[PDB]
Structure 1
Amino acid sequence: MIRDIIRMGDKRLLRVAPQVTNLGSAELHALVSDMFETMGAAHGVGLAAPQIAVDLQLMVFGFEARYPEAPAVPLTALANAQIEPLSDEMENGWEGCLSIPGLRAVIPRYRYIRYRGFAPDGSPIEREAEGFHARVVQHEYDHLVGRLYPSRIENFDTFGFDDVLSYDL
């Protein structure tokens, strides 16, 4: 089932979500399937559970094919994500958010991370990630601690409506 995505301004996006504790359950599997369905209908590249007003440490992300420079990111559902930078190096790049429709900004992120957590069937996931793959997971992780991209913008010249911006990163 497609779920409504809540918009910035909704206090439910500002919460610190608790951990997932029903790994392997039918209920988590249904939630995850809704999330992938919801992300897909919205043409997203990542979606975090608080964006459908579900207070849990859970995100889905990935796509084959709008982010032209971005290589494929495997379709992944990750519960209880933890992230650690693997270098100090920051890289700037474009982000939008389905809870902030119409807009985008340049945001600095760590270029190189490791992330760890669990797949919905309860098996561990741990991966080193870089570039857009890494950015997507850091952006979704922010949602789980009640953070959205605008509080991360450094250059406000790059923040604007997607159909109007001509900032050349």
Structure 2
Amino acid sequence: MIRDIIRMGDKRLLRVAPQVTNLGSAELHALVSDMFETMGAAHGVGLAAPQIAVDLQLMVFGFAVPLTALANAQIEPLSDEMENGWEGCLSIPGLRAVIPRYRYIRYRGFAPDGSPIEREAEGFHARVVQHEYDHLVGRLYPSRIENFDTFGFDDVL
């Protein structure tokens, strides 16, 4: 079931999401399935649950980046090195900006079946995760733009 992605301006993208407590359940497996499908129909590499108006610590992502579904995520930077790179947002369609993120992270959480997940990530993999994590804490990419020359429409830049 493809879901409606909500757009910037909606208060539901501004909340801080509660934890998932139904790992292994059929309801959650259904929601994850929906999320991968919705992510695919919109052509994303990442999608957080608040983007489809579900208030939960849950994200999907993957392109190389492993196709992953991740609940109750925590992220730890592994150095102070930041890197710049392009981002967009299915909730801000048409736009893109350059955004500084940590080059090296570790993330931890659970697969939908209850299995623990813990990985080190770098570059693009690491960026997609930082970006979706931001959704879980009510934060969007414009608030991290440093150089506003880079903010523009995809077809123009």
TM-score with structure 1 length normalisation?
0.92
CA distance in 1, matches of 2:122, 2:66: 13
CA drift of 1:162 comes to 0.5
User: 2:22: which partner in 1?
Assistant: 22
CA distance in 2, matches of 1:73, 1:92: 18
RMSD: 0.9
CA drift of 1:15 comes to 0.2
List gaps (5 residues or longer) in structure 2: none
CA distance in 2, matches of 1:75, 1:28: 17
* Residues 135-160 of structure 1 deviation map (CA, whole Å, 9 limit, x = unaligned): 00000000000000000000000000
CA drift of 1:99 comes to 0.1
* Residues 37-83 of structure 1 deviation map (CA, whole Å, 9 limit, x = unaligned): 000010100000000000000000001xxxxxxxx101000000000
The count of residues paired between Structure 1 and Structure 2 equals: 157
Give the alignment of 1:141-152 within 5 angstroms.
Answer: 141-152=133-144
CA distance in 2, matches of 1:126, 1:99: 28
CA distance in 2, matches of 1:103, 1:43: 14
* Residues 101-141 of structure 1 deviation map (CA, whole Å, 9 limit, x = unaligned): 00000000000000000000000000000000000000000
User: 2:43: which partner in 1?
Assistant: 43
CA distance in 2, matches of 1:149, 1:37: 23
TM-score with structure 2 length normalisation?
0.99
Secondary structure of 2:118's aligned partner = strand
